[PDB]
């Protein structure tokens, strides 16, 4: 497989593009502390009540320390949402919205 190139190596080969600013930001970030990057995990489902309670407890835990990053993952709904010509008096898109 074609060998890769380090981001720093790629940058130095292509030259400066958008050192003093980068090192200042690096020093500031090292000064920065406890910045939490929280990722819930793949396929969070809003339909399930047990998963809803688990996510509520997770939000309670995150309330103690608000993360500087939070990621919400794909497939928010449990089952695929799509057009329904045989509507059950309420569109699946409406449940997805709710």
């Amino acid at each position: 497989l074609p060998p890769g190139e380090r981001r720093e190596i790629t940058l130095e080969t292509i030259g400066n593009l958008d050192k003093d600013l980068k090192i200042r930001l690096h020093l500031l970030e090292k000064e920065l502390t406890d910045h939490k990057f929280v990722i819930l995990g793949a396929n969070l489902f809003l339909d399930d009540l047990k998963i809803m309670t688990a996510l509520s407890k997770i939000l309670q835990k995150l309330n103690d320390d608000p993360p500087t990053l939070l990621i919400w993952q794909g497939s928010f709904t449990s089952v695929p949402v799509f057009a329904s010509m045989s509507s059950r008096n309420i569109s699946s898109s409406t449940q997805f919205k709710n």
């Binding site: 009540l49 047990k50 089952v79 695929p80 799509f82 057009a83 329904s84 010509m85 045989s86 509507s87 059950r88 008096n89 309420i90 569109s91 699946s92 898109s93 409406t94």
Partner: protein, 812 residues
Amino acid sequence: SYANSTWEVLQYKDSGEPGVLEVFVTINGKVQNITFHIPKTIYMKFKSQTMPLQKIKNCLIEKSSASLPNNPKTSNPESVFLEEKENCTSIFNDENVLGVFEGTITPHQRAIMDLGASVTYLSGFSMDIGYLLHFPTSIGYEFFSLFKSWGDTITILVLKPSNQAQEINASSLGQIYKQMFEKKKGKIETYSYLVDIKEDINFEFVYFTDISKLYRRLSQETTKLKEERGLQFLLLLQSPFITKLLGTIRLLNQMPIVKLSLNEVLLQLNWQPTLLKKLVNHVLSSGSWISHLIKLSQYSNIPICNLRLDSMDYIIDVLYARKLKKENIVLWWNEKAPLPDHGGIQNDFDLNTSWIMNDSEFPKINNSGVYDNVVLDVGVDNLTVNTILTSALSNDALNVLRGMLKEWWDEALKENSTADLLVNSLASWVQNPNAKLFDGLLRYHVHNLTKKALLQLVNEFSALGSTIVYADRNQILIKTNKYSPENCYAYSQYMMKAVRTNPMFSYLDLNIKRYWDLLIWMDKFNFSGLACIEIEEKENQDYTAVSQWQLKKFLSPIYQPEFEDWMMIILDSMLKTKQSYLKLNSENSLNGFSHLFSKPLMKRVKKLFKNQQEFILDPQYEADYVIPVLPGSHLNVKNPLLELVKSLCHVMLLSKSTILEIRTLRKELLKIFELREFAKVAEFKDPSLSLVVPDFLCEYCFFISDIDFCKAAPESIFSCVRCHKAFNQVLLQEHLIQKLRSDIESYLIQDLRCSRCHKVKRDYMSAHCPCAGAWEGTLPRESIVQKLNVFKQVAKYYGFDILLSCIADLTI
């Protein structure tokens, strides 16, 4: 006393302890039932090294898994007792195809429903069933009922807002209720069985300031439920709004999932007229739903818990699963993903995957003309099931479905109406993505079969001395070449009998209808058919010319009456020349017609032009003279009166023989208003801009027909022609956006075509063709963008909030 009957509800005992399900079976005595452990049905086709890799703890070899048709070639044509975590069992020392696959992954509760019949005479009890559910509310009345059939007290929570008395005393409502109860008694004695309904229901409205008190009242109602009866209690909850909530509130209670009418008549001080009808519907529907569930389960061997409120296509799923389980091949059903579950991927995407779902539209053949003898003909319906039956006169699944369809057709004749309903809804299930066991290949192949069916019908009509001037696959339009009189219409019936008898079909619609003694055929919405189906006396009982004129509507509201009046004048003139030609014989009639109406046409043209000379530049007139903005057309204004005469030319241009006389009239008109004898500006080039969803269906009517949003009348999109039921807006927007974006990804997945050689881009690294010409292409973005603009115009026309959101997203 203990099971030995049908189970109304089948649900998991708990998230923990997988494989053990609770049973809500109502015994011939007092409900009560349970189920043991059921293994996780998942076939990996491999068993030799399965044991060392995982503890499957149940053996199955020699085609353990099922291969079912799909895009991957591998999936094209052993369940684990414990739900063990997967541990890379894809490796297969059996020399079979690598990969465990998930061709048959179903919940065991669904699987046991698939494996076993409903009964474990469905249930002929004299048992009473409770009838508490959410009563329909018009706007915000929050109507609800806590009613026990044995309790005799409606004990409604209806009119929950205490500020306003939404619920009426219902004393006069009660007496009208009873008098219709004897009026509707004939269905009542049938509904009086299986549940106490003949009893009069009192009215006791309860007002709740806070909804938590309402929840407490429901909890206390549940505390009554299964204690007032002690044992042997059934509940009927047909309210979709509270169907999900009550199941959580109720513990181990039994209730069917089927729904009653979603809402009642929107009437809130005068709620009595609609409360009365809603409660009548409720009491009749108790017994109606009970009997319908019983007979459908007898036909289906499925529990009442099976969902049919949206459609009985889930029953179609369970029956097809049972049928496949009989054969060596095993079902592809998958509740989790409504997409078909063939092999293990179930999610592979390629050109064929989009190919099968897209372009599922019925092709239409149109020949614009005016003819001596035109018949709109039978207008065959439900051509999908007819075609699939006539095909019997992948291949294994096709054969299984054909056998099931023949079985249902045998049931569809001289049997219960449930069999007929299931036959009608089988076509919808074949195309419904929401219904599981739905294959994109199956839908595409049924569409292609209908295409060949239309082709064979065209070929059969070709032999007859008649021409198919239009083809809709819902109504088929043919004119007869001969100028024969009334006796031909009886002869037309005889010949179309002879035509339909010849092939080996019997499912197409008979009773030729809506013959047109004269038709000026432009499209679906612009025509002048006369003397529809009758005793066929050839215009004696002349039905007035039905003429939608989606282009005439486009016109300026003041020029519209003039255009319509002149088309009646034109129609009368051609009719008179038609009797003249018929008497002469005892389109030459149209040829004489042309010279007949030439002088009035030209004289009125200039007259109108001369009037327009002063008519123009008038603020009162120009307000009327402005052409209404419609989604169909984008042509220039070009002196709307000139648009009128151009439209007249276009509607006249249909008659091939008179085209020379039409040219004479055009020369006369260009003498009337200065313009070159032949001109592109003189050419019409009318834009249609038809936005159509392929094979749209109405769930109540089950009819399959393409719906054209721009061209059809505003209520025509809303309400289908077959049944009075009106399409909901949300599904309309969903389907329109479906087609729009599906075309967008199609644009993203196209294959380039060369300039000189015109080959296809078999090369990913092309950078100009290996031919001298470059890769031209097929269908770029720009007119897709103008179609987006037409979508926006419709969005102004029709609220279409989902469409508005889609447009907003696409702009970004």
